Amino acid sequence: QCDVPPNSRFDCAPDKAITQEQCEARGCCYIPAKGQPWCFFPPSYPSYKLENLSSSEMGYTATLTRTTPTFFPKDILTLRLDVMMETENRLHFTIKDPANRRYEVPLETPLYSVEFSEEPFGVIVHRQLDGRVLLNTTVAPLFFADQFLQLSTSLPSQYITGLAEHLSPLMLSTSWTRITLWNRDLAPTPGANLYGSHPFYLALEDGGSAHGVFLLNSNAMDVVLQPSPALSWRSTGGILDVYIFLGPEPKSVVQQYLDVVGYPFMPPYWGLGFHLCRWGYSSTAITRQVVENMTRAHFPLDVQWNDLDYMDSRRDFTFNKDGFRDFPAMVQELHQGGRRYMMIVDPAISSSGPAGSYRPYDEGLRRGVFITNETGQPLIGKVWPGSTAFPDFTNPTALAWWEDMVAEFHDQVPFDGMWIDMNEPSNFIRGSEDGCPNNELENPPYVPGVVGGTLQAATICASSHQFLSTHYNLHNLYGLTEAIASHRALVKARGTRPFVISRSTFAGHGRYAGHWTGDVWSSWEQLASSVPEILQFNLLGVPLVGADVCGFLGNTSEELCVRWTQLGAFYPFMRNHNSLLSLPQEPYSFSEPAQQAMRKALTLRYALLPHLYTLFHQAHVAGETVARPLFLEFPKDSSTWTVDHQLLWGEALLITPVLQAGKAEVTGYFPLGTWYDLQTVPIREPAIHSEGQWVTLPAPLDTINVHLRAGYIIPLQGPGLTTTESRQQPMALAVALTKGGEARGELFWDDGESLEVLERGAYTQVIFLARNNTIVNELVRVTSEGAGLQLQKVTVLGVATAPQQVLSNGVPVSNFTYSPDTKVLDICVSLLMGEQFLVSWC
Ligand SMILES: *[C@@H]1O[C@H](CO)[C@@H](O[C@@H]2O[C@H](CO)[C@@H](O[C@@H]3O[C@H](CO)[C@@H](O)[C@H](O[C@H]4O[C@H](CO)[C@@H](O)[C@H](O)[C@@H]4O)[C@@H]3O)[C@H](O)[C@H]2NC(C)=O)[C@H](O)[C@H]1NC(C)=O
Ligand SMILES: *[C@@H]1O[C@H](CO)[C@@H](O[C@@H]2O[C@H](CO)[C@@H](O[C@@H]3O[C@H](CO)[C@@H](O)[C@H](O)[C@@H]3O)[C@H](O)[C@H]2NC(C)=O)[C@H](O)[C@H]1NC(C)=O
Ligand SMILES: *[C@@H]1O[C@H](CO[C@@H]2O[C@@H](C)[C@@H](O)[C@@H](O)[C@@H]2O)[C@@H](O[C@@H]2O[C@H](CO)[C@@H](O)[C@H](O)[C@H]2NC(C)=O)[C@H](O)[C@H]1NC(C)=O
Ligand SMILES: *[C@@H]1O[C@H](CO)[C@@H](O[C@@H]2O[C@H](CO)[C@@H](O)[C@H](O)[C@H]2NC(C)=O)[C@H](O)[C@H]1NC(C)=O
Ligand SMILES: OC[C@@]1(CCCc2ccccc2)NC[C@H](O)[C@@H](O)[C@@H]1O
Ligand SMILES: [Cl-]
Ligand SMILES: [Cl-]
Ligand SMILES: [Cl-]
Ligand SMILES: [Cl-]
Ligand SMILES: [Cl-]
Ligand SMILES: [Cl-]
Ligand SMILES: [Cl-]
């Protein structure tokens, strides 16, 4: 009866340290573990009972009744269960209080079979194809109290990913792991709640099938994993709103999840270029020198950034008349050179200036845009400018005011996007200047494992008021709501695609904005940790993600910055950013051989931009990932499941970086197939013929291993110091043949920044096909945007025998080279991407 296998013991004292007497008083078992809870539920612990189950066209409804109270206050004894079979792939169920509207996240919204346990109550979801049990909520009691919801399930395996934002391996440890979702300003460190919260997991099943679970709940929560294996959702409010996505492919699970929360926004092409920033570019002169120094040293740079330096007394929508007197001229110059400009914006608005002295506050105050406290005044905290109020991005008037402030500032300085920092929201003091009241929201009955042990730590009072609800319910949305507000602000101000990079995020963030991983240390550990974190954000539908290249905190080393630039060049969002007291880490600040390695990394990224842009097109229209783990592409190969120090770009490009000091080789996993060394493509084995195995590759300091998968064609474009320049260059194809002489690839092209391109059909889509010693294009769509793209080079990999002749459209080509050593046929052509062509050899 208390004979429960240790791994299957669910914690009956998650709220407090408990004694054997108190444990047995709750009706629970007390056995010290030989981590595993000492106080755990017997199989007979009171749960809810399923009653009055009925079927309809939509699905199932029932009453859940609890007869015996839990040890939490304000149990809701009568619940309503609603099970909705929404699509062949998507099962949706809610557990609500039929007597009272409870807080619900404001979001726009067969392969499975379902059965129920009566007592204790449980929802059971099978995969129809194989009968396997994916969800089973019968494993532990259902808790549904006003400020404590708990729902548990068996997991189909020890392999589960998601539940951002945390510094951890891509596959979460099931050894009694507590994962806390409570947006918190803190330098990434293991076991801590970080800047964002994504209550979604993808679970692998034996044989490489997978399913996803989304809990649509924005309250502070713990998610507890145990090695049985099983999971417990423990939220501090709202309702249980659960989506199950049946896959069966992991990539299909992600796409199914993004169907609900939104497909990733399409970035502007210039956004995929190199970004350079630091805190400490203290003048326009200094900032101009950065661009001059990069250009002088032949380093590509699309976007020049500034941190707090530009502001007047660290206030939004101002610039100082000292070092930044000619701010408008500097940004206009950047535009004249073909570059874009980004600057930091904080959420908090300085409240200390005399009335009428600082328009953002004076206007915000008048229009009631700010989060208000117990006595109905603006909540005042402390951030960079001093005393600040915090905008309420759930208030329609705050959205109008934010659009107005962005538009007015844009009329003075025409910035090309917004870097939105400190939007947890971050507070330099606890709660407010005036502290926080003593109520159940500030002092809840269950406090998740947050750093500082309070919901108020490094943020604003939980009982503060927003237009939609209390901060208690909306805190984990704050960053997301600012990203939506800023997305709209930039569309109205500029009339082209917005570019928003946000620190704080929630599920569905990728539909509006991108993300950077925050204040990472300049360390080999943080370089390695950035790979799983960038992969995690792609799975969560935020493909536009990166870490500060060479690290933010402390001083980078020349070797670290070389390796970090090499890997960082494969971040979908590539920015080098640096702290105020740090040594310079711009590419031009290093030795000649280091610069050479960093220039080579940047050159290769720029060459690949047409490919990377096409991958973002697939993310935007089909909910695909851009940077993906090997297990998303080869899920039926179980050796990929734990790989998170390699990444793919889409299906085809395998990046195997060095992540350790003093290494001149690296060992990476190579799924079954032929992998051609990308170094054999003009811009050490020529080809790795893998059975599905680990392979040691040479990797001197000037090298990063990149391999192109046999069966794939990649589009490339010639060099430039900006995408303004690069987008005008001739293009090339890299054609990686299967042993059987086949390959496939694609190109998406548009003007690179207009809104509603897909709706208006203002794009070109071309498919490339290799077969039987031929390469053709298929024209899916050709418009003015793309029709004049010049193809001048076709490189074919895995050409076994030297050709006697190479033909372009039936005519011998002007020039070609064949290397018998590397099996590479390099062909010079004069073709248009938008006109049907046929290249052949024999
Ligand atoms: C909700 O937010 C509002 C701000 O939007 C906040 O108002 C603040 O209230 C405190 C008092 O509660 C104000 O502080 C006072 O300032 C005046 C004038 O400078 C002082 O004279 C007051 O001093 C008295 O109290 C001191 C305690 O140390 C004593 O030392 C002294 O002898 C006085 O007896 C006091 O410091 C503060 O100015 C406002 N803030 C603003 C911007 O107006 C309100 O408190 C918040 N409500 C809740 C319940 O938190
Ligand atoms: C969903 O999860 C629940 C709980 O984990 C599963 O129900 C439990 O199944 C166990 C193992 O079969 C049952 O214990 C067994 O009971 C029989 C007597 O009926 C005994 O002979 C065995 O030695 C064993 O102890 C247990 O009664 C049952 N628990 C509850 C609370 O009902 C269930 O199987 C899962 N559903 C699916 C479809 O996997
Ligand atoms: C990061 O490095 C700076 C600067 O260090 C100095 O200059 C470099 C080029 C290199 O030659 C170093 O060996 C030098 O020490 C550090 O700033 C220094 O901090 C100490 C202590 O406050 C002070 O005595 C030095 O004079 C400072 N130099 C300057 C220019 O301010 C900084 O502390 C380093 N940070 C970390 C985390 O290691
Ligand atoms: C851009 O490069 C110039 C030239 O390398 C930098 O100016 C030099 O700065 C060093 C200190 O690092 C001084 O010793 C020299 O006096 C400067 N040389 C010249 C030729 O002026 C400048 O700091 C760089 N600016 C930025 C922002 O990187
Ligand atoms: O705008 C400044 C900045 C760094 C702040 C670092 C700091 C914070 C508090 C005390 C001292 C330093 N904010 C936080 C951002 O993560 C980082 O990229 C920025 O450079
Ligand atoms: Cl035991
Ligand atoms: Cl007992
Ligand atoms: Cl108790
Ligand atoms: Cl969408
Ligand atoms: Cl102040
Ligand atoms: Cl909203
Ligand atoms: Cl389309």
Query: Which ligand 2 atom sits closest to the C-alpha of 43?
Result: 31
Q: How far apart are CA 142 and CA 120, in angstroms?
A: 8
| Residue 666: count of CB within 10 angstroms of its CB | 20
Choosing from 165, 185, 302, 421, which is the catalytic residue? 421
Helix (H) or strand (E) holding 593: helix 592-622
Q: How far apart are CA 794 and CA 666, in angstroms?
A: 30
- Please enumerate in sequence order all residues whose Cβ is within 8 A of that of 495, keeping only pairs 6 or more positions apart, or say none: 755
Name the CATH superfamily for 47-261.
glycosyl hydrolase (family 31) (2.60.40.1760)
**b (16+ CB within 10 A) / e for 85-97:** beeebbbbbbbbe
| Residue 104: count of CB within 10 angstroms of its CB | 17
Q: How far apart are CA 393 and CA 531, in angstroms?
A: 32
Q: How far apart are CA 146 and CA 75, in angstroms?
A: 6
- Residue 640 C-alpha to ligand 9 middle, in angstroms? 30
> 470 in ligand 4 pocket by Cβ < 6 Å?
no
727 labelled binding-site residue? no
Residue to mutate, 432, 434, 436, 461, ligand 1, most ligand atoms under 8 Å from C-beta:
434
Residue to mutate, 276, 293, 576, ligand 4, most ligand atoms under 8 Å from C-beta:
293
Query: Which ligand 3 atom sits closest to the C-alpha of 555?
Result: 1
- Residue 456 C-alpha to ligand 1 middle, in angstroms? 20
Residue 403 φ then ψ, to 5°: -55, -45
Q: Which residues pair with 790 in a beta bridge?
A: 832
Query: Which ligand 1 atom sits closest to the C-alpha of 432?
Result: 50
CATH number for the domain formed by residue range(s) 730-841: 2.60.40.1180
Q: How far apart are CA 318 and CA 343, in angstroms?
A: 12
Q: How far apart are CA 567 and CA 647, in angstroms?
A: 10
Q: Kindly tell me the sign of the dihedral angle through the C-alpha atoms of 433, 439, 441, 443.
A: positive
Tell me which residue has its CA closest to atom 37 in ligand 3: 554
Tell me which residue has its CA closest to atom 27 in ligand 1: 434
Report which DSSP code applies to 172: P
> 780 in ligand 3 pocket by Cβ < 6 Å?
no
Token pair for 331: 């940004």
What is the residue-wise DSSP string for 658-723? --STT-SEEEEEE-SEEEEEGGGS----SEEEESSEEEEEE--TT--EEEEETTEEEEEE---SSH
- Residue 88 C-alpha to ligand 8 middle, in angstroms? 44
In this structure, are residues 776 and 641 in contact, taking their beta carbons and an 8 Å threshold? no
> 377 in ligand 1 pocket by Cβ < 6 Å?
yes
Token pair for 134: 């994916």
- Residue 13 C-alpha to ligand 8 middle, in angstroms? 9
CA dist 826 → 118, 257, 689, 734 (Å)? 68, 42, 21, 9
- Annotated catalytic, 424? yes
Does CATH place domain 269-592 in 3.20.20.80?
yes
Opening angle at CA 524, ends 520 and 530, nearest 5: 50
- Integer-rounded Cα radius of gyration of the chain: 28
In this structure, are residues 682 and 621 in contact, taking their beta carbons and an 8 Å threshold? no
> 554 in ligand 3 pocket by Cβ < 6 Å?
yes
Q: How far apart are CA 806 and CA 107, in angstroms?
A: 56
How many Cα atoms are found within 13 Å in the side-chain-facing hemisphere of 468?
21
- Annotated catalytic, 440? no
Token pair for 13: 């004292």
- Please enumerate in sequence order all residues whose Cβ is within 8 A of that of 632, keeping only pairs 6 or more positions apart, or say none: 250, 251, 254, 539, 625, 648
- Residue 394 C-alpha to ligand 11 middle, in angstroms? 5
Q: How far apart are CA 268 and CA 273, in angstroms?
A: 10
Q: Which residues pair with 235 in a beta bridge?
A: 149, 221
Tell me which residue of 75, 82, 80, 83 sits closest to 63, measured CA to CA.
Answer: 80
Residue 676 φ then ψ, to 5°: -85, 130
> 583 in ligand 3 pocket by Cβ < 6 Å?
yes
Residue to mutate, 117, 127, 152, 153, ligand 2, most ligand atoms under 8 Å from C-beta:
117
Residue to mutate, 276, 289, 296, 309, ligand 4, most ligand atoms under 8 Å from C-beta:
289
Q: How far apart are CA 376 and CA 464, in angstroms?
A: 9
577 labelled binding-site residue? yes
What is the residue-wise DSSP string for 4-51? --GGGPPBS-SSS---HHHHHHTT-EE-------SEE--TTS---EEE
- Please enumerate in sequence order all residues whose Cβ is within 8 A of that of 265, keeping only pairs 6 or more positions apart, or say none: 487, 497, 498, 510, 511, 512, 513, 544, 620
Maximal CA-CA distance, the chain: 91
Residue 764 φ then ψ, to 5°: -120, 130
Q: How far apart are CA 680 and CA 678, in angstroms?
A: 5
Tell me which residue of 835, 627, 604, 828 sits closest to 726, measured CA to CA.
Answer: 604
Tell me which residue has its CA closest to atom 21 in ligand 4: 289
Whether 730-841 and 47-261 are alike in CATH topology: the answer is yes
Neighbours of ion ligand 9 (CB under 5 A): 262-263
- Strands 806-808 and 665-670: what pairing? unpaired
> 373 in ligand 1 pocket by Cβ < 6 Å?
yes
In this structure, are residues 614 and 543 in contact, taking their beta carbons and an 8 Å threshold? no
Residue 451 φ then ψ, to 5°: -60, 135
Token pair for 473: 């319910």
Question: Which residue ranges have their beta carbon within 6 Å of ligand 2?
Answer: 43, 120, 122, 124, 133, 136, 138-139
Token pair for 241: 């709103």
Residue 317 φ then ψ, to 5°: 65, 35
Fold of domain 1-45 = Spasmolytic Protein; domain 1 (4.10.110)
Token pair for 789: 């793209």
In this structure, are residues 772 and 800 in contact, taking their beta carbons and an 8 Å threshold? no
In this structure, are residues 218 and 239 in contact, taking their beta carbons and an 8 Å threshold? no
> 279 in ligand 5 pocket by Cβ < 6 Å?
yes
Beta strands in 412-476 (DSSP E): 417-420
Tell me which residue has its CA closest to atom 11 in ligand 3: 583
- Residue 671 C-alpha to ligand 7 middle, in angstroms? 51
Ligand nearest to the CA of 309: 5
> 431 in ligand 1 pocket by Cβ < 6 Å?
no
Query: By three-state DSSP, how is residue 543 classified?
Result: coil
> 555 in ligand 3 pocket by Cβ < 6 Å?
yes
In this structure, are residues 53 and 38 in contact, taking their beta carbons and an 8 Å threshold? no
Ligand nearest to the CA of 261: 9
- Residue 568 C-alpha to ligand 3 middle, in angstroms? 26
307 labelled binding-site residue? yes
> 75 in ligand 1 pocket by Cβ < 6 Å?
no
What is the residue-wise DSSP string for 308-376? GGGSBTTBTT---SSTTTTHHHHHHHHHHTT-EEEEEE-S-EE--SPTTS-HHHHHHHHHT-B-B-TTS
Token pair for 633: 């592409």
- Please enumerate in sequence order all residues whose Cβ is within 8 A of that of 780, keeping only pairs 6 or more positions apart, or say none: 765, 766, 767
Which residue type occupies 283? Answer: S
Opening angle at CA 134, ends 129 and 137, nearest 5: 140
Output the CA torsion 246→251→254→259 (10° steps).
Answer: -80
Segments making up each domain of the chain, as ranges: 1-45, 47-261, 269-592, 730-841
Token pair for 181: 């979702």
> 380 in ligand 1 pocket by Cβ < 6 Å?
yes
Ligand nearest to the CA of 39: 7
Intra-chain end-to-end CA distance of the chain, in Å: 77
Token pair for 17: 């340290």
Choosing from 146, 185, 392, 424, which is the catalytic residue? 424
Token pair for 469: 């609800």
Q: How far apart are CA 235 and CA 372, in angstroms?
A: 25
In this structure, are residues 586 and 577 in contact, taking their beta carbons and an 8 Å threshold? no
> 289 in ligand 4 pocket by Cβ < 6 Å?
yes
- Residue 612 C-alpha to ligand 12 middle, in angstroms? 17
Helix (H) or strand (E) holding 97: none
Residue to mutate, 183, 194, 276, 279, ligand 5, most ligand atoms under 8 Å from C-beta:
279
Burial of 451 (0-12, 13-18, 19+ CB in 10 A): middle
Query: By three-state DSSP, how is residue 614 classified?
Result: helix
What is the residue-wise DSSP string for 201-235? EEEE-TTS-EEEEEE---S-EEEEEETTTEEEEEE
Opening angle at CA 43, ends 38 and 49, nearest 5: 130
Beta strands in 467-506 (DSSP E): 500-502
503 labelled binding-site residue? yes
In this structure, are residues 662 and 681 in contact, taking their beta carbons and an 8 Å threshold? no
- Quick check: bond before 408 cis, omega within 30? no
Tell me which residue has its CA closest to atom 19 in ligand 3: 581
